[PDB]
């Protein structure tokens, strides 16, 4: 598990969750997370980066998909799906 990918998602999700649940700011939540997702797209490199991707990468990609869906739907059920995935990862990297 790449320490830097772990750290950036740990801190990122802490911030995104504060903005969403605490400050009622869904745009702010999406803005913090978008560059973390883009960082995953650039694809692994270390052995540890690859290990991170195998454990969490598909779950993270799907969480972004649910967010994107929320952007068209406005249905909180979609945003819940996203958080289910984000929290699944968060809990394992903490």
């Amino acid at each position: 598990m790449d320490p830097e990918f772990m750290e950036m998602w740990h801190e990122g999700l802490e911030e995104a969750s504060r903005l969403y649940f605490g400050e009622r700011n869904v745009k702010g939540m999406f803005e913090v997370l978008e560059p973390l997702h883009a960082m995953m797209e650039r694809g692994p490199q270390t052995l540890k980066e690859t290990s991170f991707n195998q454990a969490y990468g598909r779950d993270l990609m799907e969480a972004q998909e649910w967010c994107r869906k929320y952007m068209k739907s406005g249905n909180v059920k979609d945003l819940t799906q996203a958080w289910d995935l984000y929290y699944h990862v968060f809990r394992r990297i903490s």
Partner: protein, 107 residues
Amino acid sequence: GVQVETISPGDGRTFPKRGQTVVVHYTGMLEDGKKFDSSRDRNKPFKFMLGKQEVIRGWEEGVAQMSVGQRAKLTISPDYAYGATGHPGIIPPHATLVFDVELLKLE
């Protein structure tokens, strides 16, 4: 664990079964009484499929004890909720949760 304390009884006959979609209205509060979320504030009944562990353990076990129409208070220890981790932005570590739950229907 979870304690279920009835406020208003259900029909005593129709209980959630594995694989059913359970439809509820709820309000969640921390042990101190601060509301953190409520389906009633958005006028949107909350749904989950029993047995999928899509919701915290206290819900899975507590709501399964309810019958249709029932309204109850669920008191959920951290280990049956978000545990040592909490959920960032909303549920602190080691939080006891208290929910008011109304089982509206099964689909």
